[PDB]
PDB file of C-alpha atoms and ligand atoms in Angstrom:
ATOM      1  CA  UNK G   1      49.777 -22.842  37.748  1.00 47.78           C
ATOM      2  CA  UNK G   2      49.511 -24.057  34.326  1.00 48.06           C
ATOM      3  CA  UNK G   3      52.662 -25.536  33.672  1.00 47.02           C
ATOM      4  CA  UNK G   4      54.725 -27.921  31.388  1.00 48.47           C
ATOM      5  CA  UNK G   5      55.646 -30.709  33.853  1.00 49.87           C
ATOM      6  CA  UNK G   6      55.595 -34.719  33.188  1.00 52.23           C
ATOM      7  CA  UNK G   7      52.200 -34.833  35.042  1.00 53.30           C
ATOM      8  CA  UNK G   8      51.030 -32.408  32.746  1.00 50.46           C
ATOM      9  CA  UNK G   9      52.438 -34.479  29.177  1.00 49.48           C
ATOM     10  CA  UNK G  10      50.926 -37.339  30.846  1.00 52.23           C
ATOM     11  CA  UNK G  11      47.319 -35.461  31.117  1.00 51.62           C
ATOM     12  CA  UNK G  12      48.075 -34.439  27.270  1.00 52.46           C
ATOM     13  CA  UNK G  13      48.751 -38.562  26.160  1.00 51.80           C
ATOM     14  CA  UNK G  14      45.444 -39.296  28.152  1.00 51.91           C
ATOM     15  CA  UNK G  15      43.387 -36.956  26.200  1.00 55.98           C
ATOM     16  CA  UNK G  16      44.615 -38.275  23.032  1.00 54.69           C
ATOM     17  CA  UNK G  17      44.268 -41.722  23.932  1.00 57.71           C
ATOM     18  CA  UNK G  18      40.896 -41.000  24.756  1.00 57.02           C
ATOM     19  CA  UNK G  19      40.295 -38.848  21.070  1.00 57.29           C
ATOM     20  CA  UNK G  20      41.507 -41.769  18.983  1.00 55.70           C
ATOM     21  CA  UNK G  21      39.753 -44.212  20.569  1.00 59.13           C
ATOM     22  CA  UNK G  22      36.273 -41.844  20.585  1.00 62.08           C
ATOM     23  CA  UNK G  23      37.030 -41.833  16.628  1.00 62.27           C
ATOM     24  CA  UNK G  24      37.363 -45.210  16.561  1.00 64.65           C
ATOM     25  CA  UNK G  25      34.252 -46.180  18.575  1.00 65.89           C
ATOM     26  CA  UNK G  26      31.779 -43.094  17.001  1.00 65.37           C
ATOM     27  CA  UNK G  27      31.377 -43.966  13.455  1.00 64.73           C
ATOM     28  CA  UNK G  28      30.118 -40.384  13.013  1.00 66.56           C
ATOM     29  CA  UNK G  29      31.894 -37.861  14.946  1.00 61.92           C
ATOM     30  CA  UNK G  30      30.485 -34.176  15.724  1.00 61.76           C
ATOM     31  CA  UNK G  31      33.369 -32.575  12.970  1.00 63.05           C
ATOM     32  CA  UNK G  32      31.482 -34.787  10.430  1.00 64.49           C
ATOM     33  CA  UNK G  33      27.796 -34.143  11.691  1.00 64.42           C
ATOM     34  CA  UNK G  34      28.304 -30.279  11.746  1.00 65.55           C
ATOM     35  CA  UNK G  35      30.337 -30.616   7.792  1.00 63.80           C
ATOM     36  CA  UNK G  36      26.823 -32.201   6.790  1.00 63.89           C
ATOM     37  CA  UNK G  37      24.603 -30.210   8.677  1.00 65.80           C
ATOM     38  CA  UNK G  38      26.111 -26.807   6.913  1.00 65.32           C
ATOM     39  CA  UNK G  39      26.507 -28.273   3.902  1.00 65.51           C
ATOM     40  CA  UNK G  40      30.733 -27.874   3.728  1.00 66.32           C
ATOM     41  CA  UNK G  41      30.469 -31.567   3.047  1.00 68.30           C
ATOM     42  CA  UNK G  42      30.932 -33.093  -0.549  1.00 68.53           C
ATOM     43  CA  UNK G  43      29.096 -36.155   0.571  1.00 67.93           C
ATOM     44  CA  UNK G  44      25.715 -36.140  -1.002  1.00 66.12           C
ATOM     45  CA  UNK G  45      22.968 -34.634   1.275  1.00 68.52           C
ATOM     46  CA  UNK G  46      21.026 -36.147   3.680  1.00 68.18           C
ATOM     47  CA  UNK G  47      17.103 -37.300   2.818  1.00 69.05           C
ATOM     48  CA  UNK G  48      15.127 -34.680   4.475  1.00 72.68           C
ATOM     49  CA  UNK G  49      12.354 -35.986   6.494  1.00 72.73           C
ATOM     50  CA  UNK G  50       9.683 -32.806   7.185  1.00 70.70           C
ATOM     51  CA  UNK G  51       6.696 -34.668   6.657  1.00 72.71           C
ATOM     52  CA  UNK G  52       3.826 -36.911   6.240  1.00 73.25           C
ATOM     53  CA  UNK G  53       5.270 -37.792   2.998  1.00 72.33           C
ATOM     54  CA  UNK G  54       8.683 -37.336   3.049  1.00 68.78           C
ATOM     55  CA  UNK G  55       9.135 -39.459   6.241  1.00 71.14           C
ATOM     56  CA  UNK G  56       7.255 -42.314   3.684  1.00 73.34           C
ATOM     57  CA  UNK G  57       9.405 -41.296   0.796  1.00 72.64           C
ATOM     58  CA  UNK G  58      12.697 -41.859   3.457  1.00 70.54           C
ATOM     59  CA  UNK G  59      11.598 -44.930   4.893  1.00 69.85           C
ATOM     60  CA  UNK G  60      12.365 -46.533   0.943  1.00 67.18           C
ATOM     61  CA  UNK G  61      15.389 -43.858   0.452  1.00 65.23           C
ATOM     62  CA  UNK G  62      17.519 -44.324   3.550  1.00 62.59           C
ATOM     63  CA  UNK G  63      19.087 -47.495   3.682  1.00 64.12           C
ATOM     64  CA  UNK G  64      18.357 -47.807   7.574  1.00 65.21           C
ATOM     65  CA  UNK G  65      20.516 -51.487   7.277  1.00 67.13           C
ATOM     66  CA  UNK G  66      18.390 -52.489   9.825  1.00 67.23           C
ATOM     67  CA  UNK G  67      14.824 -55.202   9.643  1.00 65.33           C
ATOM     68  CA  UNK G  68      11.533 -53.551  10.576  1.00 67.32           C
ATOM     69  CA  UNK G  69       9.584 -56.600  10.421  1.00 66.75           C
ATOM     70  CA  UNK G  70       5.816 -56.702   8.930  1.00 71.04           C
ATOM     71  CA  UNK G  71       3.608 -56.762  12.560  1.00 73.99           C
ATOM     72  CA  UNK G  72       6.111 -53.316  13.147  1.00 73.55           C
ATOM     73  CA  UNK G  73       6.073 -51.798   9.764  1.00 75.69           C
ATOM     74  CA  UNK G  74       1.667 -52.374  10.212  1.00 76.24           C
ATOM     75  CA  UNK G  75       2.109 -49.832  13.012  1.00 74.64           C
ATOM     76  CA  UNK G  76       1.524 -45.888  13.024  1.00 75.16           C
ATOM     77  CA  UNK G  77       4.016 -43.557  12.084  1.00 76.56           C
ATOM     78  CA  UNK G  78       4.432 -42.234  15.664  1.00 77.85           C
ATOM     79  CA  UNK G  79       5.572 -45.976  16.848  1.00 79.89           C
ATOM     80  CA  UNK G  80       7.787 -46.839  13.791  1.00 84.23           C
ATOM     81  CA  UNK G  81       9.673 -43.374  14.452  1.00 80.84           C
ATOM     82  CA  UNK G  82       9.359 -44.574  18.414  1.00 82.17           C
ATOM     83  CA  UNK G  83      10.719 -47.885  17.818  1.00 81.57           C
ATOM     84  CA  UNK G  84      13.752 -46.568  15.216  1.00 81.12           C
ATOM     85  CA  UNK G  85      14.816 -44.376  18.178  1.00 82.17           C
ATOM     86  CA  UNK G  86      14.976 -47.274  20.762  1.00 79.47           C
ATOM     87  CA  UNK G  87      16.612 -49.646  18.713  1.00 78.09           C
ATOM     88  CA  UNK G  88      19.293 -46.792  18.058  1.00 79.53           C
ATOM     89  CA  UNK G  89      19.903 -46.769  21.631  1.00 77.13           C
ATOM     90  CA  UNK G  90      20.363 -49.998  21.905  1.00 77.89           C
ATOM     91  CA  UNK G  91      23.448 -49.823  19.041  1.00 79.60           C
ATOM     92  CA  UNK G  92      24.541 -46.582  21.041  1.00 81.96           C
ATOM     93  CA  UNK G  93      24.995 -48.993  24.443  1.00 79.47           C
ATOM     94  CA  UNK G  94      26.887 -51.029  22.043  1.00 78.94           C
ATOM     95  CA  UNK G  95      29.396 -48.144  21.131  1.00 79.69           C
ATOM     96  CA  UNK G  96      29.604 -46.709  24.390  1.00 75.71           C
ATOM     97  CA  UNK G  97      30.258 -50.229  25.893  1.00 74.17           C
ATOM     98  CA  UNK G  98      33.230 -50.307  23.202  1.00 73.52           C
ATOM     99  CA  UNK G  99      34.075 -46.942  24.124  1.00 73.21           C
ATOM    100  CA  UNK G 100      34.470 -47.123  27.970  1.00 70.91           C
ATOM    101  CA  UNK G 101      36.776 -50.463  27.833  1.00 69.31           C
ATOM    102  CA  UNK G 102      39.230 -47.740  26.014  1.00 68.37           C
ATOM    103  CA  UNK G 103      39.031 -45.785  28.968  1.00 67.96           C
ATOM    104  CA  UNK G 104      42.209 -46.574  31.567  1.00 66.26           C
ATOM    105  CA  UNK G 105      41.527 -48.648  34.262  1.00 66.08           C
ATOM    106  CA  UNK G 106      38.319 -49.332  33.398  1.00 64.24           C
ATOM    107  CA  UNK G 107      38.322 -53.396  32.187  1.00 64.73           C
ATOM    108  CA  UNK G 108      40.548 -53.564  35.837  1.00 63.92           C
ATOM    109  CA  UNK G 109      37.289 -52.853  38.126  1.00 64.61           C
ATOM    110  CA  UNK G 110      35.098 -55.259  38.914  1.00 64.61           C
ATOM    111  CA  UNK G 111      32.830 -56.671  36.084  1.00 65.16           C
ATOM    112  CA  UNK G 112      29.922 -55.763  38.029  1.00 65.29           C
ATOM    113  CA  UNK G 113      30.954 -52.058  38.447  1.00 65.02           C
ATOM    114  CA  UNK G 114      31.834 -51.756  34.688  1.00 64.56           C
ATOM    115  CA  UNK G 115      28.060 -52.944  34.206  1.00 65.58           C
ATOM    116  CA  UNK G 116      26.652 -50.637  36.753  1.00 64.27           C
ATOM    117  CA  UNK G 117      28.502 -47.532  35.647  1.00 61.75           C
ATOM    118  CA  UNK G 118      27.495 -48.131  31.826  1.00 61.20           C
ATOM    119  CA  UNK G 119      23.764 -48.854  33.024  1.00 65.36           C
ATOM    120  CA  UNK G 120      23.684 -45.457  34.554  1.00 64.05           C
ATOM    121  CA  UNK G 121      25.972 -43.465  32.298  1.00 62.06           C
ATOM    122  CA  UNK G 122      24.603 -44.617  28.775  1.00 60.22           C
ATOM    123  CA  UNK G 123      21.346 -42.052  28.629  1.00 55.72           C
ATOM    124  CA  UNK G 124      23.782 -39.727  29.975  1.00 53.39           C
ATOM    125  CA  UNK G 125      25.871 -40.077  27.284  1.00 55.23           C
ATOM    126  CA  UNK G 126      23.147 -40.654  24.191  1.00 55.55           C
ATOM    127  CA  UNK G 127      21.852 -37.350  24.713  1.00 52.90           C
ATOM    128  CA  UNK G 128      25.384 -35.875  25.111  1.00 52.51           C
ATOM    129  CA  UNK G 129      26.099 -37.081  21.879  1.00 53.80           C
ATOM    130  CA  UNK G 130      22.947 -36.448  20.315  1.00 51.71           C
ATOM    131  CA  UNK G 131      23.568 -32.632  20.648  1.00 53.97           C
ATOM    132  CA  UNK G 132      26.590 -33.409  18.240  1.00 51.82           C
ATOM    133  CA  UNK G 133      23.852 -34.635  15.616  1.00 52.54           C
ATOM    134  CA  UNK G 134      21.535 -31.666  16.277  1.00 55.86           C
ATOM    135  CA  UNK G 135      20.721 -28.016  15.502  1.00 54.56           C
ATOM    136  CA  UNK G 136      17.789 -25.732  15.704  1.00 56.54           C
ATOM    137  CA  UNK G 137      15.946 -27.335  13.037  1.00 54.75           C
ATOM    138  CA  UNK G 138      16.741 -31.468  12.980  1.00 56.05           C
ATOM    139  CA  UNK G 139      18.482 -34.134  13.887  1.00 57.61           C
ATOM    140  CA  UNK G 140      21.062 -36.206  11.994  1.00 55.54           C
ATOM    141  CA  UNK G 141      19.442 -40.019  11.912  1.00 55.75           C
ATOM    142  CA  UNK G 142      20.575 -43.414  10.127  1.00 54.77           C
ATOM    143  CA  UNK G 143      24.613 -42.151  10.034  1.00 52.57           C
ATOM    144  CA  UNK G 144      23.778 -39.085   8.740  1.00 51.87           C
ATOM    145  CA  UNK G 145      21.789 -40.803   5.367  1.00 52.82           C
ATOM    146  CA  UNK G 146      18.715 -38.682   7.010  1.00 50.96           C
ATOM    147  CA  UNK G 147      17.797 -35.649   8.759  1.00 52.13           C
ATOM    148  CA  UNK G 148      14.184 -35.683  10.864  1.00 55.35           C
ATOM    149  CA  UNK G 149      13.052 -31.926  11.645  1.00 54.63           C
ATOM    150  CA  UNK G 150      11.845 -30.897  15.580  1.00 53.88           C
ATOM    151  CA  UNK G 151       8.793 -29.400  14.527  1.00 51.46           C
ATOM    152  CA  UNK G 152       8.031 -33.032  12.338  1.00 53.76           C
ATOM    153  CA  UNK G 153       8.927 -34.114  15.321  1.00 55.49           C
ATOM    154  CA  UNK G 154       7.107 -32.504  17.443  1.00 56.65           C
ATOM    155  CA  UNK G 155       3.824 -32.996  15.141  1.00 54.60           C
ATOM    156  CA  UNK G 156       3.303 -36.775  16.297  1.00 56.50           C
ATOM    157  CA  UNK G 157       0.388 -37.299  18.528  1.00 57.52           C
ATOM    158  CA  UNK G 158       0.607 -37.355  21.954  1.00 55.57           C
ATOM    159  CA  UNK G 159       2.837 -38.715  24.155  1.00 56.88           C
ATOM    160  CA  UNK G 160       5.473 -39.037  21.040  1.00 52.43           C
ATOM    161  CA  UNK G 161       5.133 -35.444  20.048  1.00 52.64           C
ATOM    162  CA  UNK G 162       7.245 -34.870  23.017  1.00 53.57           C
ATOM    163  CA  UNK G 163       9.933 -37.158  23.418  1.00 53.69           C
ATOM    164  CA  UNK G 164      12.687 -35.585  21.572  1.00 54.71           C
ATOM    165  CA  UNK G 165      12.025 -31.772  21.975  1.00 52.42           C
ATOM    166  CA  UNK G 166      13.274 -32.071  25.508  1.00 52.64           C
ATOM    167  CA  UNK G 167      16.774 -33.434  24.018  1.00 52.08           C
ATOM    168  CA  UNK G 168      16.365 -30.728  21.409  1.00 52.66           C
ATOM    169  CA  UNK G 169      16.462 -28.029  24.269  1.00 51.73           C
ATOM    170  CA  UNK G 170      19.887 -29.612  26.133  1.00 54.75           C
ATOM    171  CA  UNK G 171      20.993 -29.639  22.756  1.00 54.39           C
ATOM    172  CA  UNK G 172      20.898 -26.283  21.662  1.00 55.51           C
ATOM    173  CA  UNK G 173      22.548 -24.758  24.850  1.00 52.21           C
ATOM    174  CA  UNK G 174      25.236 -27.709  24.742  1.00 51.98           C
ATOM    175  CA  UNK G 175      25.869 -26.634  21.290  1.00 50.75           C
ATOM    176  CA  UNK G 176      26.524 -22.603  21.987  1.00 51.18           C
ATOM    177  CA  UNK G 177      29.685 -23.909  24.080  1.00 50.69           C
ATOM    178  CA  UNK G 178      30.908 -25.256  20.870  1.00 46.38           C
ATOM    179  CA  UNK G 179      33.041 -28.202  22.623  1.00 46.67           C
ATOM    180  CA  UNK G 180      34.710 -30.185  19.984  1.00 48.21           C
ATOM    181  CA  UNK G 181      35.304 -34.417  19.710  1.00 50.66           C
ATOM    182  CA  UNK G 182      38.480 -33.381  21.244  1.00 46.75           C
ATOM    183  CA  UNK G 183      36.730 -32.023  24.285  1.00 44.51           C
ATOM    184  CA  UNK G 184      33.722 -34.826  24.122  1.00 42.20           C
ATOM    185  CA  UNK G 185      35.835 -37.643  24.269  1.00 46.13           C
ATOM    186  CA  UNK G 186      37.415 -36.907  27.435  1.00 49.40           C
ATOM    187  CA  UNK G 187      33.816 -34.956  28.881  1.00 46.78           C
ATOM    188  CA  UNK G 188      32.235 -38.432  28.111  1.00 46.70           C
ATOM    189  CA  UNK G 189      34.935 -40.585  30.244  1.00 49.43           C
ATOM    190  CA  UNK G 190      34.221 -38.273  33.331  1.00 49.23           C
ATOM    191  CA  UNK G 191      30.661 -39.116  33.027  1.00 47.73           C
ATOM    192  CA  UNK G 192      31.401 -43.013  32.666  1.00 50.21           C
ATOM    193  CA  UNK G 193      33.328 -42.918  35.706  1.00 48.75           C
ATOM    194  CA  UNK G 194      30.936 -41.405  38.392  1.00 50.70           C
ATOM    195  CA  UNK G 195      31.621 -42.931  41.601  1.00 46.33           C
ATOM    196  CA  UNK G 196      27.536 -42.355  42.746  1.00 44.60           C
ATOM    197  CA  UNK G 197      26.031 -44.771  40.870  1.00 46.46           C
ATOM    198  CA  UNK G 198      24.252 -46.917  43.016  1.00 49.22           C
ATOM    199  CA  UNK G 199      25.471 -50.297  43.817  1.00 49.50           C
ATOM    200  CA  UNK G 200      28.886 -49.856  42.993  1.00 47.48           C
ATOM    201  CA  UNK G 201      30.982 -52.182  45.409  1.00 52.86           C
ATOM    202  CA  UNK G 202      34.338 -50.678  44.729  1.00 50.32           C
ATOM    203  CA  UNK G 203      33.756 -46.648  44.767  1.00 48.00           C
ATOM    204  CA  UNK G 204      37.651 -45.358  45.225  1.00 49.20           C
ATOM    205  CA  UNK G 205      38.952 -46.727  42.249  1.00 51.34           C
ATOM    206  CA  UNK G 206      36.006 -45.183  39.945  1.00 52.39           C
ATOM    207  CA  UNK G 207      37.295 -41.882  41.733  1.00 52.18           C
ATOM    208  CA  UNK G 208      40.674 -41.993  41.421  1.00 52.15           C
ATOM    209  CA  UNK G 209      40.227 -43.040  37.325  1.00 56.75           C
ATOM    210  CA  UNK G 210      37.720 -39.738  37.538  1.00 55.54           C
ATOM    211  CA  UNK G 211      39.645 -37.391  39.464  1.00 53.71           C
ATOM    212  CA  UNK G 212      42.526 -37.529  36.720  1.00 54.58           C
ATOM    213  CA  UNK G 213      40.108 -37.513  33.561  1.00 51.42           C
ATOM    214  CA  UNK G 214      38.861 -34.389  35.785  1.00 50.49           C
ATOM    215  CA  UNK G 215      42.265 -32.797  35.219  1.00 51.16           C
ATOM    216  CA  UNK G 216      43.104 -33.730  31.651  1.00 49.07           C
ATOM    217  CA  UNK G 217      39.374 -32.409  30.429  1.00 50.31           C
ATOM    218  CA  UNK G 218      40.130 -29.211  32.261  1.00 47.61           C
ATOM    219  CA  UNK G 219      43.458 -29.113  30.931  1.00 49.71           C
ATOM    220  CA  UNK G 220      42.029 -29.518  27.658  1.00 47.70           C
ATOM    221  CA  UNK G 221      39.537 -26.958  27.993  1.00 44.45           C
ATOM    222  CA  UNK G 222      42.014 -24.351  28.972  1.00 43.69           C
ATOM    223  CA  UNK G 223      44.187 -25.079  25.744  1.00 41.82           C
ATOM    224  CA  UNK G 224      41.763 -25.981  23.334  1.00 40.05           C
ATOM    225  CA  UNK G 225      39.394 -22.424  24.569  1.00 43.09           C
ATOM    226  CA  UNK G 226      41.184 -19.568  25.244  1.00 40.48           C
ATOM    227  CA  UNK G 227      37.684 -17.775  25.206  1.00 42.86           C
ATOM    228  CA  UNK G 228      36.585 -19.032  28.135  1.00 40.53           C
ATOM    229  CA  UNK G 229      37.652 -19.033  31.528  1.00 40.82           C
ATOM    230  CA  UNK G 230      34.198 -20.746  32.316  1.00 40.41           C
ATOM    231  CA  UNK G 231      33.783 -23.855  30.437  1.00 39.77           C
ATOM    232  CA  UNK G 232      34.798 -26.428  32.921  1.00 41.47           C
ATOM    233  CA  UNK G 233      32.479 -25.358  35.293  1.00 41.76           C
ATOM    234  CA  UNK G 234      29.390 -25.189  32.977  1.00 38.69           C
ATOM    235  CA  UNK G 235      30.462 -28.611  32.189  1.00 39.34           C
ATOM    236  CA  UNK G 236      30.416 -29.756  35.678  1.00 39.51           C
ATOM    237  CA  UNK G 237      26.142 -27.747  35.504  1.00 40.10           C
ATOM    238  CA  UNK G 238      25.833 -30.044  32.395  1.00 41.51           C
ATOM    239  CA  UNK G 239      26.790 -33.341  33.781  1.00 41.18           C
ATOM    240  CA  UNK G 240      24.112 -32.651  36.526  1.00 39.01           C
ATOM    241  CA  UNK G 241      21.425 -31.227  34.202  1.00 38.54           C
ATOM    242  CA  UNK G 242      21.977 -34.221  32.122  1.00 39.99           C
ATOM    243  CA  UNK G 243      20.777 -36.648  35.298  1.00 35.75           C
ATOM    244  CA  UNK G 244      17.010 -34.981  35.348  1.00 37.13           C
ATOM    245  CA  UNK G 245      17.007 -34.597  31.727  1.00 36.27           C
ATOM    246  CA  UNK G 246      17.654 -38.648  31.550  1.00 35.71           C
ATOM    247  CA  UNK G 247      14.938 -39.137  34.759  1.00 35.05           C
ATOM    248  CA  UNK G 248      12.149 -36.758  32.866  1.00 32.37           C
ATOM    249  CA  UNK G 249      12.981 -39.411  29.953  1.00 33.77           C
ATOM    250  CA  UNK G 250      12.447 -42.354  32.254  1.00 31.02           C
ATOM    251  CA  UNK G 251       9.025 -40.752  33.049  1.00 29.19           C
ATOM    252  CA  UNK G 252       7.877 -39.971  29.838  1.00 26.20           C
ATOM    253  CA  UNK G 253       8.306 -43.711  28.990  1.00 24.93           C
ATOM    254  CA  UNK G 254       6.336 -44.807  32.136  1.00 24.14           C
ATOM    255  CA  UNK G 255       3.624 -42.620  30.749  1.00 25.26           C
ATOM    256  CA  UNK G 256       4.358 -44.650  26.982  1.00 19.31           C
ATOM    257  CA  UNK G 257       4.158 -48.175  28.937  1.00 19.45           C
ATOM    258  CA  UNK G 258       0.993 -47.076  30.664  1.00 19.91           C
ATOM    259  CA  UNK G 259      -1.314 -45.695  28.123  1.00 16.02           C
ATOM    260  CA  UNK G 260       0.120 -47.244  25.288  1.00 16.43           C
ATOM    261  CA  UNK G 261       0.031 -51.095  26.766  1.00 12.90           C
ATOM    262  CA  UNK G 262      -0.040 -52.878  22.750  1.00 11.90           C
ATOM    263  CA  UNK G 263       3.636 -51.239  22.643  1.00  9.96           C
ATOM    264  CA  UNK G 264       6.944 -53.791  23.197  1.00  9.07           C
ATOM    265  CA  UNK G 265       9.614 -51.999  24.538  1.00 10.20           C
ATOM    266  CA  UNK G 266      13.358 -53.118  24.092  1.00 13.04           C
ATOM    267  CA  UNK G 267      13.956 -55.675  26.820  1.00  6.02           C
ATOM    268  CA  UNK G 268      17.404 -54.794  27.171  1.00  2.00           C
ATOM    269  CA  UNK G 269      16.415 -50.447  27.388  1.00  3.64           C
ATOM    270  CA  UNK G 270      13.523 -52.400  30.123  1.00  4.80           C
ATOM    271  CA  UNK G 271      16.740 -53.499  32.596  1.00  2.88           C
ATOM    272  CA  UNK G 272      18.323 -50.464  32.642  1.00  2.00           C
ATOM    273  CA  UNK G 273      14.917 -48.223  33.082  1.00  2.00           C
ATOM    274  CA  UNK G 274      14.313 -50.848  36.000  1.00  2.61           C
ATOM    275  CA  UNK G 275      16.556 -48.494  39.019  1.00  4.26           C
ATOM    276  CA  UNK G 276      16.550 -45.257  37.460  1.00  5.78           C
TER     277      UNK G 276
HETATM  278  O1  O86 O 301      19.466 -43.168  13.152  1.00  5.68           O
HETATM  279  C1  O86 O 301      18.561 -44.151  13.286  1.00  5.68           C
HETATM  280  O2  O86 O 301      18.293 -44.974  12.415  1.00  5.68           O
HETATM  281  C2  O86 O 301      17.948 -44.196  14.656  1.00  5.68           C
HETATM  282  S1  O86 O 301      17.848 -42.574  15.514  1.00  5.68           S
HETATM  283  C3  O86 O 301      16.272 -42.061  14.988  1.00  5.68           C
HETATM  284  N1  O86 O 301      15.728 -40.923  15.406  1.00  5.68           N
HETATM  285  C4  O86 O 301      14.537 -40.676  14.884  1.00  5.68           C
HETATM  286 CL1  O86 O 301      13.820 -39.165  15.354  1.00  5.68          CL
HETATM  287  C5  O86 O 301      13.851 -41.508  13.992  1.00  5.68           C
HETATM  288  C6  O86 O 301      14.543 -42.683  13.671  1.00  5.68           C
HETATM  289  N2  O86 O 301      14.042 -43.723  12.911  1.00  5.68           N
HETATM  290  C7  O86 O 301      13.060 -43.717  11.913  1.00  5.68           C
HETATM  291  C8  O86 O 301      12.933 -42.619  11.079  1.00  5.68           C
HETATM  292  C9  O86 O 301      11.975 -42.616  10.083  1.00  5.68           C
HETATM  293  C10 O86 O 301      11.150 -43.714   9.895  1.00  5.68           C
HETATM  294  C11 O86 O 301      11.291 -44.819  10.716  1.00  5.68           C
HETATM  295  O3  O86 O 301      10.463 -45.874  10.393  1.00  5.68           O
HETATM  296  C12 O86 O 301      10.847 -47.219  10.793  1.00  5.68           C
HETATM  297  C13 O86 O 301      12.189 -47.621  10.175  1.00  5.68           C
HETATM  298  C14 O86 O 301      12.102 -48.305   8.825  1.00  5.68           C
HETATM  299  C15 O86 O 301      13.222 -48.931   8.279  1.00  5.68           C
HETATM  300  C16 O86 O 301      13.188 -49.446   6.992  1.00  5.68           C
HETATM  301  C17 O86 O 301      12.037 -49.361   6.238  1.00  5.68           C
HETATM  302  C18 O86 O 301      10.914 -48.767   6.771  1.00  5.68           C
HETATM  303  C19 O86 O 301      10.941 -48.245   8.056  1.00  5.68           C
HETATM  304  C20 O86 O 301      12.234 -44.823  11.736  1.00  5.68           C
HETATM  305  N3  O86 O 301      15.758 -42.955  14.146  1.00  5.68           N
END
């Protein structure tokens, strides 16, 4: 039943719509995270942070364009690393915010759906895109001018030494189904538009924008991987995986605001970890 029909051109001009405005929003896309992470890049390399020492010799090298003030930089390693990530995710809402008004139909709902939908989608999303910025031994950080290893990572003291191993772990099965931004774009509109968010006044219209992005990402998937005839429907497991991935998060921080009271976290990150 794949077929070259007008509603089928018109799934095709949605997907690209979708890619060029992805490239647009996404200073660094997945094509450019996986050129540096194997090296195929002529850009210089990444600062490679592995240690006690390198993470103090990157903290002067990368130019993180970005003010750690003095009562933050007089705090441990484990909460300056802590505190880079949050503040990161508060520039990701930013991009993803920029991102979904792209999306068709979307500035037409209701303000306070768009709002809802990006409070419950953006975590979602982060650690979708994440996996683009990952493999088995790092992650990408500061656009790419750094890379942080897992097991540096993983080396903090407790409760950081386990915040981003569990993003590590989505990551490197997301990875093996070697979706490109091609794919992403559209798999990230789907996600935007979930019609089960709660609160959401106005559910049909969030379905009917969904149940076409539905069809062009599984359009796309057919073309763009001919070797697989099951990649839509592990992407349907990973949209749902990604909801208890992003609720284990929301613990883990409970944990942080309980036993580790001194620590401020990001009042905006605070609204949206209110009803999740
Ligand atoms: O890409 C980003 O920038 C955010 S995503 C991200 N992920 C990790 Cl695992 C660490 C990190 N920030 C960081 C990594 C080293 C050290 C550090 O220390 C505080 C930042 C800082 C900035 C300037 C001078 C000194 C310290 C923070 N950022």
């Amino acid at each position: 039943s794949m077929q070259l029909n007008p509603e089928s051109a018109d799934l095709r001009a949605l997907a690209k719509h979708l890619y060029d405005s992805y490239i647009k929003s996404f200073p660094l896309t997945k094509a450019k995270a996986r050129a540096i992470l194997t090296g195929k890049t002529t850009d210089k390399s990444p600062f490679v942070i592995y240690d006690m020492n390198s993470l103090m010799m990157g903290e002067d090298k990368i130019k993180f364009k970005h003010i750690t003030p003095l009562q933050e930089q007089s705090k441990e390693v484990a909460i300056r690393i802590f505190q880079g990530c949050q503040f990161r995710s508060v520039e990701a809402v930013q991009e993803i915010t920029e991102y979904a008004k792209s999306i068709p139909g979307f500035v037409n709902l209701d303000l306070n759906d768009q709002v809802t939908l990006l409070k419950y989608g953006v975590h979602e999303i982060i650690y979708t895109m994440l996996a683009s910025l990952m493999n088995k031994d790092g992650v990408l950080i500061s656009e790419g001018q750094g890379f942080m290893t897992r097991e540096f990572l993983k080396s903090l003291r407790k409760p950081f030494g386990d915040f981003m191993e569990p993003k590590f772990e989505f990551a490197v099965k997301f990875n093996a189904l070697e979706l490109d931004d091609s794919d992403l774009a559209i798999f990230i509109a789907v996600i935007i538009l979930s019609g089960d968010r709660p609160g959401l006044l106005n559910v049909k219209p969030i379905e009917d924008i969904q149940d076409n992005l539905l069809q062009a990402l599984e359009l796309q998937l057919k073309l763009n991987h001919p070797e697989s005839s099951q990649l839509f429907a592990k992407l349907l497991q990973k949209m749902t995986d990604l909801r208890q991935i992003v609720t284990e998060h929301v613990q883990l921080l409970q944990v942080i605001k309980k036993t580790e009271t001194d620590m401020s976290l990001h009042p905006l990150l605070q609204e949206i970890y209110k009803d999740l």
